Amino acid sequence: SSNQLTVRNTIRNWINDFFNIAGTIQRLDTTMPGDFLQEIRSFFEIKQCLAMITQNLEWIENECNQFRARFDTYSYLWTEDEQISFNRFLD
Amino acid sequence: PLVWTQLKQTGTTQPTARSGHTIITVGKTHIMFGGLDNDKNNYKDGKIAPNNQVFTLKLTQNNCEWRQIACQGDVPLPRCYHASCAISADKMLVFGGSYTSNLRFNDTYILKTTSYQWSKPANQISGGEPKNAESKIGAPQPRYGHSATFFEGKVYIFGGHGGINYQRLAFNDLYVLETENFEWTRLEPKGNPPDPRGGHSAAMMANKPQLMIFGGWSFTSQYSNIMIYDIEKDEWVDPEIAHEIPKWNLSGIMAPSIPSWKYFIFGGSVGSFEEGGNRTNSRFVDDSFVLDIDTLSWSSINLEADETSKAVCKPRPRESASIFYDSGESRAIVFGGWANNWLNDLWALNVSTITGPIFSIKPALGPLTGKTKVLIEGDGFKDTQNISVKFSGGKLEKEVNGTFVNEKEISCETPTFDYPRSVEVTVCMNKGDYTITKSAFTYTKADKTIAYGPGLLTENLIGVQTTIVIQARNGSDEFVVTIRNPAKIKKEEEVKEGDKANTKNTIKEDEEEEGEDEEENKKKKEAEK
Amino acid sequence: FINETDIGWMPYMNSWLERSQINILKQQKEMANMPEYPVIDDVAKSVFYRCFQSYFEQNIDVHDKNRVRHICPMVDIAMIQTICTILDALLIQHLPKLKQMKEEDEKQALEAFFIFAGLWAIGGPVGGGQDDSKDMKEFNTVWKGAAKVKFPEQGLCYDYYYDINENKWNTWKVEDYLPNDQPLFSKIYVATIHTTRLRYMIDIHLQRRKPILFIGSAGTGKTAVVRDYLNSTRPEQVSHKTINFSSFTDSLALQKNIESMVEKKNGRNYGSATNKVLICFIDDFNMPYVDKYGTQSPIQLLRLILDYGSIFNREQLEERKFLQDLLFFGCLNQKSGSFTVDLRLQRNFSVFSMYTPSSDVIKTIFGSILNAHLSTIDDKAQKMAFKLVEATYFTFDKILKNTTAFAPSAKRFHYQFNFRELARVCEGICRTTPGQYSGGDQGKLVRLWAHEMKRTFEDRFIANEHVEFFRRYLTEAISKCIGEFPETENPIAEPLIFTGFVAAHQGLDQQYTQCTIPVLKRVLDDKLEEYNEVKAQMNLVLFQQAMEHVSRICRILDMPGNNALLVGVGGSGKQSLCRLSTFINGFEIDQLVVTASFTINDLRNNLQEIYKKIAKPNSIARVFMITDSQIKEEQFLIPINDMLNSGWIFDLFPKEDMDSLVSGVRNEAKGEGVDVNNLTALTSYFLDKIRKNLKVVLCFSPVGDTMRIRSRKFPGIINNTSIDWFHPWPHEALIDVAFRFLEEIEFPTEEIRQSISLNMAKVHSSIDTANEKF
Ligand SMILES: Nc1ncnc2c1ncn2[C@@H]1O[C@H](COP(=O)(O)OP(=O)(O)O)[C@@H](O)[C@H]1O
């Protein structure tokens, strides 16, 4: 989506809250206003863990797209069609 | 027509999805090697490592085949986030990488495309092997997510996210090397530096000493400002042309266009934050923006066709990707990257704005009855054979004989138009009629009047018949002869079938004579005589 | 005197392998448009030298005249040249695949590549005789003496190309006909096995600069195979223009055609600027006038253009004028004009037999046209398609197999039965509109067939014995193929008349259904009243046989493109019946008016007046009436034969007038939805409109072999037009014709007036039985 509230956009906001942990430390050398978020996102171990979460999110969506489709088949079509078209089909 | 179109990969061994991967065209062959493969088939025993696997890229009629080359001489070690560039059309090096986060390489490793053999360069990298801290011989301090621009006989690296020992930061500094010997010289500009950034792109602009460094990232705060650097006079000039939104970990490729060289940035992560704190929210943009170097300005580009979807079917953003451009087919192609997940989907697009090498026409105005030869200019214009231009357009289809004066110049005669309406000029070849913004053409008193004879200029007019001959230039015109003298001049007038006049004159006196010839109550080019 | 064995053909084979002759010519000539030859690698050379020598020197079967029955008398070198050009084109296509393969599978390919190259070089020109099918099956067994690379069984050697990636001998794959909406049937082109394996061989001789020649019976469909290829070429690579030889096409007339095609390069050179390939497709190669000695001037010119490439400019005969980047695509038919052309040209060409219609090739063309066109009409009455196409062959075969009845002879010169007839049978079935045929088609179709068959064979026939022989075959065909034999009453009958104007007149929409004679008698009589009232008055009787004649001339004008040819003894009223037939249809007859002093240039302004009326868009299709008397000299026909052969007579205008006639039909093409400002499809689309809106009805008499010598000189007259023969008036007709004229004469008891008109017929019938006795 990227709009309103969605299971991904919530899990996106969740995922974020752990990267937000970078800020709280506020660096141990050089400049005071520095972050760690950059370094944490270069670490290979975290990428793999982040990429594994996204793979599992795309699994459910496909089987949920098959689950919803079942009802959609006969049922979407009737809400699209009008009463006049129903009249034209009859006579 | 410009539109994003997915390309299906069909090979014996297709490449697995990656993030730390770089693609660089060299001669007529595009070669990709890259690491960070989701699939633990490399190292294993806990943690993900890079793969040092090379792959060739071939594409024909929108169909790609992948072909990896195991057989080399030496092998380099597995890299992730590692700037590569091309020397000449043979010698591809790669420099700098990463290995289990804490270890970072600072060793160059050449590859000869024709032999697909790697090598260690002279005695510059005697002993490689993986190590947290490497600071000797080589000037540059080990770094990942950096950038390498190639120029005539010299490679330049500006990129960041790295340091000696355990320290981690972005680089303010530019390290030069001379490929002829592989000597590492740090070059400090006299100009006031740009803020230290890592995870960007840089490339030479318009085949000039200036190279431009857009986007980037740093522990302090992300940046999003272009910064050029001419090797001549050392000090960098600052355009100070920024983007709308701050961008980082993008991927940009240079494109040749004769009128004005164009640069194309795709993917990356954007976000606007105030100094320290937060920075956590990371939006990724699919929309690739377009820069012209002669303009120095960022103009966003839109899809023309939706392919009957009735909605823009663009690829995912993919943050850290790899994009390479073909000068043959005039298209930019990006393999994939890391938009949170890993994906193996090669998406291309053909650039409408770039065309095989005017722009402008002169004259753009003409009379219908006349037959003049114009001059259409642009770029990628074929010489003699294949060259074909479109005429009229105003409720009509016309094809005019074209001749290429240059590769940026095409001569063609104006077609006889019945109605004085709106005229449009195109060009035919490629898929159908590959053109830009069409060259706009716009189609009784005659300004043309040609005269020559011994009855004009100095000649003293005697009893003898002093002759001239005009041009009719015809369907209602007037042609008034006038011979003022001291005595009574004779004056004849014979309209011939050669499309000319024959006006003699016999003045009886001789003192300083001068004959005026008017066409529609207006003097012809020549006066007096 | 050079002997053939002294010089040989080996020196060419060795010089082609080493790339010795080829290499020198490319370097040391103006010919910069030479298609670069492939690299004959050290192995690839050995494998051909080893093979060429092993399938020519060694094979006695290959050179045995009785085993390998050629059409034209191929010279040995002419065959070696065609092998070499095909081997060139195979290598260039499969060179990077060969170099990736290993020693054993590379060798077996290069061997197969020869066998296939040879197969066409030798087996291609195999054909002719009576049974082309047997002269193929005689060759099929000798070239199935093919050393290491054996054929698959259950197929001729022709039906197999060597695929590099399977290494099998796959069989040629044929693209199933998709129904287009071409109104001209001549544009319809159904791919067969034979038409794809020629399409390849034309691409193999265009990739090289090797001119091709197709040789096959008058109506085999050679022109169509090439006229498809030229249409499917790219307009930037190839530029195609046909030269249809007329007998009178002298060496001057060819040079004007070639000079019009070719532009002016730098110096004395003449090619296409931008190195295009300028195809000059000769059709009817044999036709050129054979002088007393036996040497055709235009043909000898071509042998000056192929060899040295230098046409002496007929004005200023000092200027050499060198010609460049030309190919020539011949379409010679054996059994017409100069049966064969000088072997000194046929050498330069690769010859490719086009075989007389097979039982399969007919079923894959006309099967595919009807199945497509009856998917339209009805879901039922498809299964009738193959049943009718089985029949239209069965009948077509039992005509060709009985040669003593129906064979092309001096008196039977128009009895030529080939694809042309099966095309305008399958055209006449393609006129069935869905409303007036849909439903039970068991009977209605098979009549429409019987009729369409009948009136493109009966029409042809002279002798009534031949008309009887036909109707026996036609009622055998219907007992086997259509197999119903519906009743005791045959679908075939005497009063079977089908007409598309009888429906129109009443007020019904684009029917081609059968009327009965008394319905046809009301409509025609009403339409003759309507022609007397508006045009110059022509009184004719309309008896059943003249009734039928309008019926079967209105049919030949309605079929778009198809030009009528009414043969009959002068006085038959062929001219008068045509004028009626024309007025029945919404068409406007244009007859030229010959004075005693008439010139070719004045004909060419009368023809050019007609071509200003057709070329305007909303045009009532003008008919063009010609007779035996109107053609004072044999020259006037030359323009006319080019009109009825295709579209419009080449060079009847300047190229400035034709750039304005094209422009008037740009406002029609946008309305049709055809591509505009292409200037290749627009010129083509206009030629289709001119062909459609011009009908050419010529009206000859078969007396003193003046028609036969015309048919010999102009290929157009007989083959390109749908002949309809005018027999002498039946006894039933004469009694009517007499009685109409005896009206407005007094007679005592009116019983006399009928009775006289019996004896007026009998006398005229009783002279014809004495005239035969005499
Ligand atoms: N495959 C085909 N599809 C459609 N019509 C065909 C086909 N083959 C032959 N014909 C028709 O056969 C007729 C006679 O053949 P044509 O091409 O005129 O050459 P030729 O004089 O050599 O027989 C033409 O009307 C042509 O359209």
Ligand SMILES: Nc1ncnc2c1ncn2[C@@H]1O[C@H](COP(=O)(O)OP(=O)(O)O)[C@@H](O)[C@H]1O
């Ligand atoms: N059915 C008929 N009834 C009466 N007269 C006829 C009939 N058919 C033909 N004729 C006459 O015979 C003439 C033959 O001359 P013409 O029309 O020039 O034909 P042709 O082409 O045979 O010379 C016709 O003009 C007409 O007067």
Ligand SMILES: [Mg+2]
């Ligand atoms: Mg033909």
Ligand SMILES: [Mg+2]
């Ligand atoms: Mg006549």
